[PDB]
């Protein structure tokens, strides 16, 4: 399940730090340098975080137009997926 993959990557990054930047999560999930990340990979991850947020597992903050997306953990992140 795609959401399961993303759920695991976020629990790792958000277990130490309170927030992680989407583009950092995307480099981790793509297993490559950011210069090589493809539109298909970026869209898959973007949709995955929207799913996790609608399920109540993460929080999303973006304060600038096309700006960095900040992700924080919710309690349900460590109980679902």
């Amino acid at each position: 399940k795609a959401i399961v993959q993303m759920a695991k990557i976020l629990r790792k990054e958000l277990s130490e730090e309170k927030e992680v930047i989407f583009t950092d999560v995307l480099k981790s999930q793509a297993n490559t340098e950011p210069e090589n990340i493809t539109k298909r990979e970026a869209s898959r991850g973007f949709f995955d975080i929207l799913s996790l947020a609608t399920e109540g597992c993460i929080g999303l903050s973006q304060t600038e137009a096309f700006g960095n997306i900040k992700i924080d953990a919710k309690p349900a992140l460590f109980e679902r997926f």
Binding site: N36, I37, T38, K39, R40, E41, A42, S43, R44, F46, F47, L50, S51, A53, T54, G56, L60, Q62, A65, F66, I69
Partner: protein
């Protein structure tokens, strides 16, 4: 120009102020998981632009006012701000660049940018596809009359045709009266009335009775002439508007249907044409035949086509129709939901080959094969603790293909 953003306020699933941002993107897809509010995007767009297809229920409810504003940058490019508000009693307020106006003045501002509510040349609902794929030939004629402007002459056309019909039989009736009067004159003169009046005021009765029959006929003649000329003028204008639209769509449909049915296996695509069903001197009184055959198919009836093939033929017709009066932007409902992967790819290719200055695309997309090819994305998610929909953006032009 183009839309650079929509701003919402307490609209349906959105609590407070939110932004649907497009920026300088000419191909934006709006996406999100089910029950996130994505479906409310169509609603907000068609609301702020004035589509009628309950008004109190659009306001957010926790379970009080709401508005939607379209921000549009013309070719100059100056800013246009089109705001529609739902007030506390359920009525609509209209504002243009932050000044109150009435509904008519609102539409006119939109028409000036070729955003035509009468033709809905800027938006394809999902229901439009079903409606197109099941419509009768006479329904298609009426649709072309609607988008072409010729339908606004229909009632005047039919009123004046009736006047011609009446004034015609009135002329024939008064002509037969005059033929009987002049026939009674020949009989009354062979009566040798000169002798009778020499050894009579009735001779003056025939004087004014014949003078009356003449004046009455000449009036029926001039009235029929006026009705015939009024009717022919309206008929000519109705035909002019209709033929201009029909000619455009008939020419385009062949090309658009190919583009949407070309594949690696069948690089020639299918074949489509439009035609007036029956022979007539007044095309808008006949039905319009739309025939489309995918590659390597050829039967007379289209109802033997698959649901996918019917959908793609309907989309081709909708594109061909809306190209007659090109909108600066174009909003496409979530049609990729029901389509197989091959057809989703063809929609994607068609959009990328047209999305740019002069035709901005805003697409509701369920299928990654489509929305992963956008210039930018609008993601809609549900904040359950706050009980509201929210939006995120991602510029996909930063990332590479392959």
């Amino acid at each position: 120009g183009k839309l650079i953003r929509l701003e919402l306020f307490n609209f349906k699933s959105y609590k407070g102020h939110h932004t649907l941002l497009f920026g300088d993107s000419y191909f934006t897809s709006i996406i999100g998981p089910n029950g996130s509010g994505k479906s409310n995007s169509m609603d907000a767009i068609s609301f702020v632009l004035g589509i009628k297809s309950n008004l109190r229920d659009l306001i957010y409810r926790g379970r009080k006012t709401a508005w939607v504003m379209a921000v549009y940058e013309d070719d100059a490019g100056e800013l246009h701000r089109w705001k529609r508000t739902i007030t506390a009693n359920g009525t609509s307020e209209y504002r243009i660049n932050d000044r109150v106006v009435n509904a008519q003045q609102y539409n006119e501002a939109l028409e000036k940018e070729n955003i035509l509510i009468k033709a809905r040349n800027f938006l394809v609902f999902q229901g439009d596809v079903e409606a197109i794929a099941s419509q009768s030939p006479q329904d298609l004629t009426r649709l072309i009359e609607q988008i072409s402007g010729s339908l606004e002459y229909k009632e005047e056309y039919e009123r004046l045709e009736e006047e011609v019909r009446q004034a015609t039989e009135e002329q024939a009736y008064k002509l037969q009266r005059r033929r009987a009067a002049n026939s009674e004159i020949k009989q009354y003169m062979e009566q040798s009335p000169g002798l009778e009046v020499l050894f009579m005021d009735r001779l003056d009765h025939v004087r004014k009775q014949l003078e009356q029959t003449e004046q009455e006929f000449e009036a029926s003649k001039a009235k029929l002439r006026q009705a015939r000329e009024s009717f022919q003028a309206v008929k000519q204008k109705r035909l002019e508007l209709f033929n201009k639209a029909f000619t455009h769509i008939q020419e385009q449909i062949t090309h658009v249907y190919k583009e949407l049915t070309r594949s690696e296996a069948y690089p020639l695509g299918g074949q489509a044409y439009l035609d007036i069903e029956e022979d007539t001197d007044t095309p808008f009184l006949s039905g319009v035949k739309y025939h489309a055959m995918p590659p390597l198919k050829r039967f007379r009836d289209m109802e033997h086509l698959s649901g996918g093939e019917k959908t793609m033929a309907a989309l081709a017709l909708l594109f061909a129709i809306h190209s007659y009066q090109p909108s600066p932007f174009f909003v496409l409902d979530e049609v990729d939901a029901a389509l197989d992967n091959a057809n989703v790819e063809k929609i994607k290719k068609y959009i990328r080959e047209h999305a740019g200055p002069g035709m901005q695309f805003i697409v509701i997309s369920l299928k990654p094969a489509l929305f992963q090819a956008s210039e930018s994305l609008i993601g809609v998610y549900r904040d359950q603790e706050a009980n509201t929909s929210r939006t995120l953006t991602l510029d996909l032009r930063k990332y590479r293909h392959h």
